[PDB]
Protein backbone atom coordinates (compact mmCIF):
# COMPACT_ATOMS: atom_id res chain seq x y z
CA UNK A 1 0.00 0.00 0.00
CA UNK A 2 1.94 2.99 -1.30
CA UNK A 3 -0.42 5.48 0.33
CA UNK A 4 0.73 8.69 2.02
CA UNK A 5 -0.01 9.66 5.60
CA UNK A 6 -2.41 12.41 6.68
CA UNK A 7 0.26 15.12 6.76
CA UNK A 8 1.66 14.13 3.36
CA UNK A 9 -1.86 14.03 1.90
CA UNK A 10 -2.63 17.51 3.24
CA UNK A 11 0.66 18.84 1.84
CA UNK A 12 -0.18 17.30 -1.54
CA UNK A 13 -3.63 18.91 -1.44
CA UNK A 14 -2.09 22.30 -0.65
CA UNK A 15 0.46 21.97 -3.46
CA UNK A 16 -2.30 20.95 -5.87
CA UNK A 17 -4.50 23.89 -4.88
CA UNK A 18 -1.51 26.17 -5.43
CA UNK A 19 -0.36 24.73 -8.77
CA UNK A 20 -3.36 23.29 -10.65
CA UNK A 21 -4.35 26.68 -12.06
CA UNK A 22 -1.46 26.44 -14.54
CA UNK A 23 -2.59 23.18 -16.18
CA UNK A 24 -5.24 22.53 -18.87
CA UNK A 25 -7.05 19.91 -16.77
CA UNK A 26 -6.76 17.79 -13.64
CA UNK A 27 -5.29 14.88 -15.60
CA UNK A 28 -2.38 17.01 -16.85
CA UNK A 29 -1.11 17.39 -13.27
CA UNK A 30 2.01 15.28 -12.57
CA UNK A 31 0.32 12.62 -10.43
CA UNK A 32 2.42 9.94 -8.76
CA UNK A 33 -0.32 7.29 -9.04
CA UNK A 34 -4.05 6.78 -9.41
CA UNK A 35 -4.70 6.68 -5.66
CA UNK A 36 -3.03 10.07 -5.20
CA UNK A 37 -5.09 11.45 -8.08
CA UNK A 38 -8.40 10.26 -6.63
CA UNK A 39 -7.60 11.28 -3.04
CA UNK A 40 -6.33 14.76 -3.92
CA UNK A 41 -9.14 15.48 -6.39
CA UNK A 42 -11.87 14.31 -4.00
CA UNK A 43 -10.43 16.35 -1.12
CA UNK A 44 -10.08 19.41 -3.35
CA UNK A 45 -13.68 19.14 -4.56
CA UNK A 46 -15.02 18.58 -1.04
CA UNK A 47 -13.04 21.51 0.37
CA UNK A 48 -14.05 23.94 -2.38
CA UNK A 49 -17.68 22.79 -2.20
CA UNK A 50 -18.24 22.76 1.58
CA UNK A 51 -15.87 25.58 2.70
CA UNK A 52 -13.82 23.25 4.89
CA UNK A 53 -11.37 24.69 7.40
CA UNK A 54 -7.93 23.25 8.11
CA UNK A 55 -9.04 20.91 10.90
CA UNK A 56 -12.05 19.81 8.84
CA UNK A 57 -9.67 19.25 5.93
CA UNK A 58 -7.45 17.01 8.07
CA UNK B 1 -28.19 10.84 9.44
CA UNK B 2 -31.46 10.10 7.63
CA UNK B 3 -29.98 6.85 6.30
CA UNK B 4 -28.99 5.81 9.82
CA UNK B 5 -32.49 6.60 11.10
CA UNK B 6 -34.09 4.65 8.24
CA UNK B 7 -31.84 1.66 8.91
CA UNK B 8 -32.75 1.73 12.61
CA UNK B 9 -36.46 1.91 11.78
CA UNK B 10 -36.26 -0.91 9.21
CA UNK B 11 -34.28 -3.15 11.60
CA UNK B 12 -36.79 -2.47 14.37
CA UNK B 13 -39.64 -3.40 12.03
CA UNK B 14 -37.86 -6.57 10.89
CA UNK B 15 -37.06 -7.71 14.44
CA UNK B 16 -40.76 -7.28 15.34
CA UNK B 17 -41.77 -9.82 12.69
CA UNK B 18 -43.80 -8.03 10.00
CA UNK B 19 -43.70 -8.54 6.22
CA UNK B 20 -42.12 -6.09 3.78
CA UNK B 21 -44.70 -5.19 1.09
CA UNK B 22 -43.98 -5.92 -2.57
CA UNK B 23 -44.33 -2.48 -4.27
CA UNK B 24 -47.63 -1.56 -5.94
CA UNK B 25 -46.76 -1.33 -9.66
CA UNK B 26 -49.03 0.71 -11.96
CA UNK B 27 -50.99 -0.93 -14.81
CA UNK B 28 -49.89 -2.49 -18.10
CA UNK B 29 -49.47 -0.49 -21.33
CA UNK B 30 -51.21 -2.77 -23.89
CA UNK B 31 -50.51 -2.42 -27.62
CA UNK B 32 -50.59 -4.68 -30.66
CA UNK B 33 -51.53 -2.43 -33.59
CA UNK B 34 -51.48 -4.13 -37.03
CA UNK B 35 -52.41 -0.89 -38.82
CA UNK B 36 -50.34 0.84 -41.51
CA UNK B 37 -50.42 4.23 -43.22
CA UNK B 38 -52.72 3.34 -46.13
CA UNK B 39 -55.40 1.63 -44.03
CA UNK B 40 -55.42 4.47 -41.49
CA UNK B 41 -55.73 7.01 -44.31
CA UNK B 42 -58.68 4.98 -45.60
CA UNK B 43 -60.21 5.06 -42.11
CA UNK B 44 -59.77 8.85 -41.92
CA UNK B 45 -61.35 9.24 -45.36
CA UNK B 46 -64.26 7.02 -44.30
CA UNK B 47 -64.80 9.13 -41.17
CA UNK B 48 -64.70 12.29 -43.29
CA UNK B 49 -67.22 10.88 -45.77
CA UNK B 50 -69.58 9.72 -43.01
CA UNK B 51 -69.43 13.04 -41.14
CA UNK B 52 -69.41 15.10 -44.32
CA UNK B 53 -68.84 18.61 -42.96
CA UNK B 54 -65.15 18.06 -42.17
CA UNK B 55 -63.95 20.47 -44.86
CA UNK B 56 -60.37 19.36 -44.14
CA UNK B 57 -57.77 19.50 -46.91
Amino acid sequence: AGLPNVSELVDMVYEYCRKRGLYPDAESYPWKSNAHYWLVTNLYQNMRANALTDAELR
Amino acid sequence: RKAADELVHMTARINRGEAIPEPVKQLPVMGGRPLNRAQALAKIAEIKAKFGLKGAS
Binding site: - | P23, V24, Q26, L35, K43, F51
Partner: protein, 185 residues
Protein backbone atom coordinates in the same frame (compact mmCIF):
# COMPACT_ATOMS: atom_id res chain seq x y z
CA UNK C 1 -54.79 9.12 -30.68
CA UNK C 2 -52.15 11.85 -30.51
CA UNK C 3 -49.65 9.86 -32.60
CA UNK C 4 -52.32 8.36 -34.87
CA UNK C 5 -51.32 4.74 -34.17
CA UNK C 6 -54.78 3.22 -33.78
CA UNK C 7 -56.38 -0.07 -34.80
CA UNK C 8 -59.83 -0.92 -36.14
CA UNK C 9 -61.53 -1.19 -32.74
CA UNK C 10 -60.10 2.16 -31.64
CA UNK C 11 -61.27 3.77 -34.89
CA UNK C 12 -64.76 2.33 -34.36
CA UNK C 13 -64.86 3.68 -30.80
CA UNK C 14 -63.72 7.11 -31.99
CA UNK C 15 -66.33 7.11 -34.76
CA UNK C 16 -69.06 6.25 -32.27
CA UNK C 17 -67.92 9.00 -29.91
CA UNK C 18 -67.84 11.55 -32.73
CA UNK C 19 -71.31 10.47 -33.85
CA UNK C 20 -72.70 10.91 -30.34
CA UNK C 21 -71.04 14.32 -29.99
CA UNK C 22 -72.32 15.51 -33.37
CA UNK C 23 -75.81 14.28 -32.48
CA UNK C 24 -75.82 16.17 -29.17
CA UNK C 25 -74.17 19.47 -30.22
CA UNK C 26 -74.18 21.29 -26.87
CA UNK C 27 -70.46 21.91 -26.21
CA UNK C 28 -68.81 25.25 -27.02
CA UNK C 29 -65.11 26.02 -26.61
CA UNK C 30 -63.32 29.39 -26.54
CA UNK C 31 -59.52 29.11 -26.56
CA UNK C 32 -58.76 32.83 -26.31
CA UNK C 33 -56.00 34.07 -24.01
CA UNK C 34 -55.85 36.99 -21.61
CA UNK C 35 -59.61 37.34 -21.18
CA UNK C 36 -61.11 39.99 -18.93
CA UNK C 37 -64.26 39.27 -16.88
CA UNK C 38 -66.21 41.66 -19.13
CA UNK C 39 -65.40 39.60 -22.23
CA UNK C 40 -66.30 36.37 -20.43
CA UNK C 41 -69.64 37.81 -19.33
CA UNK C 42 -70.39 39.16 -22.81
CA UNK C 43 -69.60 35.87 -24.54
CA UNK C 44 -71.60 33.86 -22.00
CA UNK C 45 -74.55 36.22 -22.46
CA UNK C 46 -74.30 35.86 -26.24
CA UNK C 47 -74.22 32.05 -26.03
CA UNK C 48 -77.20 31.99 -23.65
CA UNK C 49 -79.11 34.38 -25.91
CA UNK C 50 -78.46 32.33 -29.05
CA UNK C 51 -79.06 28.85 -27.60
CA UNK C 52 -81.71 29.39 -24.92
CA UNK C 53 -79.61 29.29 -21.76
CA UNK C 54 -76.48 27.66 -20.35
CA UNK C 55 -76.02 24.60 -18.17
CA UNK C 56 -72.44 25.08 -16.98
CA UNK C 57 -69.54 27.51 -17.38
CA UNK C 58 -65.93 26.36 -16.99
CA UNK C 59 -62.77 28.48 -16.81
CA UNK C 60 -59.21 27.11 -16.91
CA UNK C 61 -57.61 28.85 -15.36
CA UNK C 62 -58.21 32.07 -13.44
CA UNK C 63 -54.51 32.88 -13.01
CA UNK C 64 -54.34 33.59 -16.77
CA UNK C 65 -57.17 36.14 -16.68
CA UNK C 66 -56.38 39.86 -16.73
CA UNK C 67 -57.80 43.03 -15.23
CA UNK C 68 -55.76 45.84 -16.84
CA UNK C 69 -56.84 48.56 -14.40
CA UNK C 70 -55.60 46.52 -11.41
CA UNK C 71 -52.43 44.89 -12.77
CA UNK C 72 -50.39 46.72 -10.11
CA UNK C 73 -51.84 44.73 -7.16
CA UNK C 74 -52.50 41.02 -7.63
CA UNK C 75 -54.80 40.67 -4.60
CA UNK C 76 -57.21 43.36 -5.84
CA UNK C 77 -57.18 41.82 -9.32
CA UNK C 78 -58.05 38.38 -7.94
CA UNK C 79 -60.78 39.88 -5.75
CA UNK C 80 -62.31 41.68 -8.73
CA UNK C 81 -62.16 38.51 -10.85
CA UNK C 82 -63.85 36.43 -8.15
CA UNK C 83 -66.53 39.06 -7.56
CA UNK C 84 -67.26 39.34 -11.29
CA UNK C 85 -67.47 35.55 -11.63
CA UNK C 86 -69.89 35.34 -8.69
CA UNK C 87 -72.01 38.12 -10.21
CA UNK C 88 -72.06 36.32 -13.57
CA UNK C 89 -73.03 33.04 -11.90
CA UNK C 90 -75.91 34.71 -10.07
CA UNK C 91 -77.01 36.58 -13.20
CA UNK C 92 -77.11 33.62 -15.59
CA UNK C 93 -78.32 31.19 -12.88
CA UNK C 94 -75.66 28.68 -13.96
CA UNK C 95 -72.83 26.94 -12.08
CA UNK C 96 -69.41 28.44 -12.79
CA UNK C 97 -66.38 26.24 -12.15
CA UNK C 98 -63.06 28.10 -12.20
CA UNK C 99 -59.68 26.38 -11.92
CA UNK C 100 -56.97 27.88 -9.72
CA UNK C 101 -53.41 27.19 -8.60
CA UNK C 102 -51.69 26.92 -5.23
CA UNK C 103 -48.54 28.38 -3.72
CA UNK C 104 -45.23 26.50 -3.62
CA UNK C 105 -45.01 26.61 0.19
CA UNK C 106 -47.56 23.76 0.31
CA UNK C 107 -44.78 21.42 -0.84
CA UNK C 108 -42.75 22.23 2.29
CA UNK C 109 -45.34 21.05 4.82
CA UNK C 110 -45.22 17.58 6.36
CA UNK C 111 -48.65 16.83 4.87
CA UNK C 112 -49.14 18.23 1.36
CA UNK C 113 -52.91 17.83 1.18
CA UNK C 114 -54.22 21.33 0.38
CA UNK C 115 -56.05 23.54 2.86
CA UNK C 116 -57.84 26.87 2.53
CA UNK C 117 -54.78 28.85 3.63
CA UNK C 118 -52.94 27.33 0.66
CA UNK C 119 -55.03 29.72 -1.49
CA UNK C 120 -52.53 32.42 -0.54
CA UNK C 121 -52.88 35.75 -2.41
CA UNK C 122 -56.54 34.77 -3.01
CA UNK C 123 -58.34 35.21 0.30
CA UNK C 124 -61.30 36.71 -1.55
CA UNK C 125 -61.59 33.40 -3.40
CA UNK C 126 -62.09 31.61 -0.09
CA UNK C 127 -64.51 34.32 1.04
CA UNK C 128 -66.69 34.33 -2.08
CA UNK C 129 -66.66 30.74 -3.36
CA UNK C 130 -69.71 28.59 -2.64
CA UNK C 131 -67.78 25.34 -3.15
CA UNK C 132 -64.03 24.67 -2.98
CA UNK C 133 -62.48 21.36 -4.06
CA UNK C 134 -58.79 20.43 -3.94
CA UNK C 135 -57.33 17.67 -6.11
CA UNK C 136 -54.65 15.54 -4.44
CA UNK C 137 -52.75 12.61 -5.94
CA UNK C 138 -50.37 10.88 -3.54
CA UNK C 139 -48.37 9.20 -6.32
CA UNK C 140 -47.34 12.63 -7.65
CA UNK C 141 -45.16 13.33 -4.60
CA UNK C 142 -44.24 9.74 -3.64
CA UNK C 143 -43.01 7.21 -6.20
CA UNK C 144 -43.50 4.33 -3.74
CA UNK C 145 -47.07 5.31 -2.86
CA UNK C 146 -49.60 2.60 -2.06
CA UNK C 147 -52.42 4.74 -3.53
CA UNK C 148 -51.35 4.65 -7.18
CA UNK C 149 -54.26 5.44 -9.46
CA UNK C 150 -56.27 6.84 -6.53
CA UNK C 151 -57.06 10.56 -6.33
CA UNK C 152 -58.72 12.52 -3.53
CA UNK C 153 -61.19 15.37 -3.95
CA UNK C 154 -61.10 17.35 -0.69
CA UNK C 155 -64.02 19.68 -0.04
CA UNK C 156 -62.32 22.57 1.72
CA UNK C 157 -65.49 24.65 1.92
CA UNK C 158 -69.10 23.77 1.18
CA UNK C 159 -71.54 26.54 2.01
CA UNK C 160 -74.73 24.44 2.00
CA UNK C 161 -73.52 20.97 2.97
CA UNK C 162 -70.86 18.81 4.60
CA UNK C 163 -67.14 18.59 3.90
CA UNK C 164 -64.78 15.65 3.51
CA UNK C 165 -62.79 13.53 1.08
CA UNK C 166 -64.08 11.64 -1.97
CA UNK C 167 -61.87 8.96 -3.51
CA UNK C 168 -61.77 8.39 -7.27
CA UNK C 169 -59.75 6.25 -9.67
CA UNK C 170 -57.43 8.22 -11.96
CA UNK C 171 -56.89 6.75 -15.44
CA UNK C 172 -54.30 9.04 -16.97
CA UNK C 173 -54.07 6.65 -19.92
CA UNK C 174 -57.56 7.79 -20.98
CA UNK C 175 -57.31 11.15 -19.14
CA UNK C 176 -60.32 10.29 -17.00
CA UNK C 177 -61.61 10.08 -13.44
CA UNK C 178 -63.85 7.16 -12.49
CA UNK C 179 -65.82 5.95 -9.50
CA UNK C 180 -63.67 4.23 -6.89
CA UNK C 181 -64.60 0.54 -6.70
CA UNK C 182 -62.33 -0.28 -3.76
CA UNK C 183 -63.38 -0.81 -0.16
CA UNK C 184 -64.97 2.20 1.53
CA UNK C 185 -64.66 3.11 5.22
Amino acid sequence: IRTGQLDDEDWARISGTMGILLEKRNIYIDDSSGLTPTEVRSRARRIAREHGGIGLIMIDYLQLMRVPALSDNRTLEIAEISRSLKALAKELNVPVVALSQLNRSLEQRADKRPVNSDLRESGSIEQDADLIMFIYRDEVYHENSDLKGIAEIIIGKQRNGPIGTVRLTFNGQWSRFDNYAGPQY
